[PDB]
Amino acid sequence: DYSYRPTIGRTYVYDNKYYKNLDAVIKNAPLDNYLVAEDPFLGPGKNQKLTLFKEIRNVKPDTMKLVVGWKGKEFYRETWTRFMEDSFPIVNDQEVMDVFLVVNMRPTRPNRCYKFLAQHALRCDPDYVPHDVIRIVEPSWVGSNNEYRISLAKYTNSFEQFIDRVIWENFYKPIVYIGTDSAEEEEILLEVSLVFKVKEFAPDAPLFTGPAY
Amino acid sequence: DYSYRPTIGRTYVYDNKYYKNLDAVIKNAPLDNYLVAEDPFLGPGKNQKLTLFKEIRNVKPDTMKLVVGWKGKEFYRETWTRFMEDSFPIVNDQEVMDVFLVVNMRPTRPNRCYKFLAQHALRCDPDYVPHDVIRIVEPSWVGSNNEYRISLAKYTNSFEQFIDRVIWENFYKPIVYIGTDSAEEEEILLEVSLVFKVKEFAPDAPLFTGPAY
Amino acid sequence: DYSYRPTIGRTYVYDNKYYKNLDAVIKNAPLDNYLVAEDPFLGPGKNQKLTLFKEIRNVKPDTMKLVVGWKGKEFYRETWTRFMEDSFPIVNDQEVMDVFLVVNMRPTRPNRCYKFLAQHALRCDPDYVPHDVIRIVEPSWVGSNNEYRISLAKYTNSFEQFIDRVIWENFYKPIVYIGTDSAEEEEILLEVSLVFKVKEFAPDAPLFTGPAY
Amino acid sequence: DYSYRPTIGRTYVYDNKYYKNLDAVIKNAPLDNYLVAEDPFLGPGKNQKLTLFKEIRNVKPDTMKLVVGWKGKEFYRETWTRFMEDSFPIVNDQEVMDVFLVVNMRPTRPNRCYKFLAQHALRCDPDYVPHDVIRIVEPSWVGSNNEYRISLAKYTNSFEQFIDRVIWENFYKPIVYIGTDSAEEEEILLEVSLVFKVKEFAPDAPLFTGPAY
Amino acid sequence: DYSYRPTIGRTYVYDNKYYKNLDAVIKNAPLDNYLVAEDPFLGPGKNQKLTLFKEIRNVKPDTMKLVVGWKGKEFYRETWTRFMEDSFPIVNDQEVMDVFLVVNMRPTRPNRCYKFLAQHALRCDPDYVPHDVIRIVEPSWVGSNNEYRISLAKYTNSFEQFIDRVIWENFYKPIVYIGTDSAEEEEILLEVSLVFKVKEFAPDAPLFTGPAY
Amino acid sequence: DYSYRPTIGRTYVYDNKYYKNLDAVIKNAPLDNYLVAEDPFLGPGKNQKLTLFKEIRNVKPDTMKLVVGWKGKEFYRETWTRFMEDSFPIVNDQEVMDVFLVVNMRPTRPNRCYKFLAQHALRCDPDYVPHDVIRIVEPSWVGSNNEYRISLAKYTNSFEQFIDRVIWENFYKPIVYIGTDSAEEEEILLEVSLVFKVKEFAPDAPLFTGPAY
């Protein structure tokens, strides 16, 4: 019409990142020109959390400690093995939209008040042994969920096949450092997981006992 | 000065995605530390909508139907042909910033109340015939504009040349599924388009009748 | 518990772009389903501004003028030389997270009221001489900080080595145009810089006078 | 006193319609000069719902269909029979304050959005066969409870006695039409009931096993 | 005009019940589509209160006691006699618009907190002796004015003439029960009155001493 | 469910007076226990205004003048004649829901500020000549629409038939008085109309040129 006054929702997808217009997100219970991205764990696709290990680290003020120092081959071994062990059988066409290295952290003692800090690097060659302890320099501040979530992005019978099809080139080998803004040493319990975002294309078709019909 | 109280606008560009600071977007008629992205159709660059086809689909509850199943060669044929047919002559240096596959949907009957749902996949090899009908699993929710817009990104005389310069490697072949959150079958009319974002570099120069001067 | 009412902060990293949930950003002194990105200059990693040159341009209404027309080799020469000259010695493992071409603009005369406009292109081959003057077509609007900031992304002893390791393939050669929304010619002073985002991994280790211990 | 500032509640009864002053209804947790009527089902007297039948009707846009076409004798037969069958024994003096013909309507399919419309006529002589289908003309709009409630107003051993005492003259024989504001045909499930408002005068006296005392 | 924004007052009369539009009643210092009725004692016509008797009743919890048990002849005798005794001479044409049986109630002891409850019946034949005490069943709740007001509706020299012209058929013989929501016995003082609403048509004409002129 | 928080609309019809719950009327852009009536001219059924005459009256302060003094036979003659003259042919089954005597009033001079006042009487026998001028006594106050609307309620070839079927017993012969609250004489122009509320039962059937089919 010649005049309009309500806000309409619109969505976009960029490389499996989903976005919605800001005005429509605000009005939930000019701004309209702008978009916000959906939380990946809350957005489209299934979530699949593969918890890899726990680890205790004691971190001195103004430093961060290395959480994981796997070689590339080992990172891929652990990732493929845990994912296939969890998933098989993979019964439908699906797409892994992304994989997040998630680091969950908590204090080992109560009555502590501090924030967590983090930094990561995505490596291509296992050629490089990282420092075990670094100084804090312009870190990422971890929010109150106490989780640091790193996107790693950018059907095989065995790990050998997985490597032969160089599918490991599809995602980075991460190393991650965790510290705090505390002025004392802090003991921290870390849990390291991979969260896969999976888009499943399951046909509208039943499972029958054989032989069918 | 020693003290400041107003908000200043700042912009960033990431791979032809434009961003502005949130505080400056809010104040339009700390937050300042954060950015929001501009709607691509409202942001820089020209819009060019190439409508490809319409299609009616009847979708059962808890399912979605395939909208388009073109082979790669055919997707590229249709895209190149429609774009060049529309555009020629391309008179100035320009850059295709992105191309969106847009799916517009509407009910064929009035007095229906439901939301649209969607999922897509970006393919590299036409080697794969998609299911025509799938079950709904953690879909994307389509907003009230009833449009699903998928970025496909990441000067030729003929389609043969276009293929020879492997320019098709610059953008993905999409397949898209549409359904509803309805509890009855719904007949839906779909319109599928490509919207090109074009950045034109037109010289400050007139068109003269030949010979010039 | 069976019921929850407060908002918790959560963070994600995508290719060194950091994001936080919108509800937690709003509550700083449903929305929670959405993320906003951190300003790169305010977010993690060190900032390093390498100012390259100043330039005066006089721009006619409805046009924009070319700011920089370097050949690829020259862009890389200037970038490598200025960065290494500034940085050496590079004493710790570090990662260049991104590099921004920043264009800062100001009027040369007072009492002018207009907005700045901009457009850029990221080139791969120096094979192409850009127009010096173009018409304004769906430009980017520059905010009140009067800066246009372009991400260019996606340890050497000499420039020859830098080229031999084809490290120049890691970032684009930019060309940028600047104009105004003014209805008169405007004289403008431009300052062109590179701002590097650097993530430093400095060990928790002192510097000793040799020999140590 | 010489001055008063609070509102006092006052009630009136008109032919078993109860009213209260508006100001006192507003202040529940000049206006005082006006009254509002109590909802009859929420107001004094017992409610007694006698559900008569269900019926499916398919209604075309801009029309309404006849819900019930009983002859007078049949309306009275059904009303007397259902009421006495339900009520006997009628153990105390009571007064039927009113009887409502209630039409409850619902769609037979989900995901439809429309409003219901209705019109009725109160007849005196069964001499008249109503149209089965009429056009919508200045109808009553049914509210979101999807019920149309029609007052019909203005102790017998048998229906013969009921007719002999011409008690049927106390209430009208209704015919009712139902349609929608939909632009498509709509299938609708109707439930037709009589709701009696009964005022019971039960003595303060126990029931004893005989013989008493 | 082409556009209107203020509310206009409108009135209707239904059988001497006066109504005004709700929006105009609200704005006193869409809603406009609805009417509220004027309080009869505050609305048009004169008020004439004929107080008939007082009575003390002691009421047990969950019961109500009969206030008045007059035979029809006696009700009419008392009404005609009190009205004519009060009114004569009736000097102008007038219309009795309605007559209300009003029951005013108050506790006989202070420091009691309870609400009054009531129910009535309008009878046609004195053939029926009412229970003196009944149980409370879906009663009318009396407001804080502690008055229950019952409309009875729907020029003679003597009561004999009044009966001969069967004018008693113009209004009902009421019986009324009063109780409380108290959990103890309550002693209550009742005052029973008739309030006549009278519309007087007095000519614009003086009273002269005879002979006139 | 175990808990509910929104308001639902409900409607009732009493003798062609339509009512809606107050809470649902308020929420248009406990209270729910109460109803408000729809404006009859805005509510269901067609409106049909038959304007009968205009008349100028000059009214002295504290008085009202008679607007219309028709005998019963004449009132019925004028009503039947004007209604049939307007309506014929009456092509469908219809019901006259009510008839309103409407008196519209306006000053004959500008720059006057006063309110209109009114009183009416519904007569049964033309046996009675009304005073032409009466004193103002507890009148009805006319709202700002300057209209007094009186319900008169409670298919013939000729007026003789209309009288023979004693259909005149269905509605009252009104007399109406109009005055002002002015302290000077006021000249007023009156327009007297009948507004019929008509409920039409038009079959879903076309009009064909004869012979049909």
Added chain:
Amino acid sequence: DYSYRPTIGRTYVYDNKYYKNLDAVIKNAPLDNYLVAEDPFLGPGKNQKLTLFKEIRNVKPDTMKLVVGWKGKEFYRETWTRFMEDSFPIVNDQEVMDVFLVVNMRPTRPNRCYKFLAQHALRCDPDYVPHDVIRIVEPSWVGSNNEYRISLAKYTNSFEQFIDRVIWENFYKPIVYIGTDSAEEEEILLEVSLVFKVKEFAPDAPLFTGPAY
């Protein structure tokens, strides 16, 4: 001090017009840069109202009638005579600060709604007979106090002395026209007065019976 936050009152006098700062007038229970004038009748100096005459005028729409047409000699005669008659003895030094011709107007009939309009002229020579009736052209709108107050500004034993000292040159001879914005003729009662503003300098000294001391 180095910082101030409250508002201080300040006053100025211009030719016996008193002014106060606006911010201080607002705060009574940047703006401070501005002044408002005191109402002369409410401001310093005594008020002395000399009522000269009443007059009835009947004014046609879009016109104004002359209120007073005195010759200069007569205006001065009436002013001097009335002032001295009222004032004598003038016991203290005093200053006439100003004299206002005040025209007070009221309707002669009730229930009229219109505004008053006025225009005046200050004359120097009685040489000029004014029109008795003029058309309304860009008049002054009289406020709801229904008074038009005209400043006339810019100790004698007799009028002869008053004229000999040419004291009449100190104030203008006014003529004034009054009309209304009414669309009918309006009868209006006017009262014409002079209000003197007098500043009295009474010594701090008693009155004694002679001889003093």
Added chain:
Amino acid sequence: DYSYRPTIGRTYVYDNKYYKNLDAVIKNAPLDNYLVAEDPFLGPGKNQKLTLFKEIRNVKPDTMKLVVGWKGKEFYRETWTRFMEDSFPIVNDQEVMDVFLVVNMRPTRPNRCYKFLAQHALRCDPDYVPHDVIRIVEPSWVGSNNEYRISLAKYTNSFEQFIDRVIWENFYKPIVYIGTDSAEEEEILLEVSLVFKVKEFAPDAPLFTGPAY
């Protein structure tokens, strides 16, 4: 009465300046003790704009340039000639209430942001040649209407007569300077006019073709 709560409008006239009480001006859709003056162009009397000339001036920062340097004789010649040329015939008695020298200013180039500044002097003798350029010293700040309006105050067949009756003594010969608060030179287009305020006394009398009657 003993108590009053509303505000009443009151007006005063001082030498053709009209004033209204502040409280009554505020309440338009203690303060009452104060008056505000009516805008002369919006207040009583006709407006008559005589545009004299345009002029371009280029003004350096911190200076103002002379707009007009007419000798007294020339100012009067131009004023009389333009006024009589415009007005003749002057058909009714009228009074020139005031004359304003109005200077209207605008930039000659777009996209400039500055305020205008002004100062004037009212001269009596043309004996004095003003500086063409002065420094800015405590100037008047011109508002956003970009107009400076100077009151000049305090029937002839020819200019010779106008001078002979020394009517030029009734108003001042103005000189005016205009500058800006800009920090660069600014080119400005000025338009200089005289706006006469005229109070017309037109009789209530028609124009007839001769001979009349």
Added chain:
Amino acid sequence: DYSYRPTIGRTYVYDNKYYKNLDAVIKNAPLDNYLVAEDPFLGPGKNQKLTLFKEIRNVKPDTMKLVVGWKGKEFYRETWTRFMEDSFPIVNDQEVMDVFLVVNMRPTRPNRCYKFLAQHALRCDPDYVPHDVIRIVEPSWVGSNNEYRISLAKYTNSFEQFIDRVIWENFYKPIVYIGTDSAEEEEILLEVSLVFKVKEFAPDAPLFTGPAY
């Protein structure tokens, strides 16, 4: 345009009194029809304060004491002498816009709470010795700045020349009285000054050492 919604600033000058529209003054961080005057000390023109003397006065309740009783010759002597002594050399053309007699008052003791009151008279002939003490009669109330400021309005080598050019006729000789609203005697310290408003016309021209150039 066809519609406007913002307020524009406008200014007027009346005899060196500057005014601005009220709506534009209010909106600083219909009303628009009205003007407010600028504070003279805050408005255009330079301020020049010449402090003449201090004086202590002890004032009894309900009285005011004379502050200054200079003869005319003496007032002019003191004014000319102090002004020329302060100003010489007067290097540029300037205009004295006005001169204010300012009386500043303060208590000589702390912990007193009262308001100051004042009255003045502007005299023409020194022929008149004022009372030293007067009674308070409708005084001016002094604001919290404790200053009373009186406008006196309406290039010479010596005072003799000043008198010979009768320049003293340009401004009044003031006498002023000060008191308090106190109920006890109050000792008060007065400071009496002249504040000149000066409009300076300084050429855009430097001062050179002689000889120039």
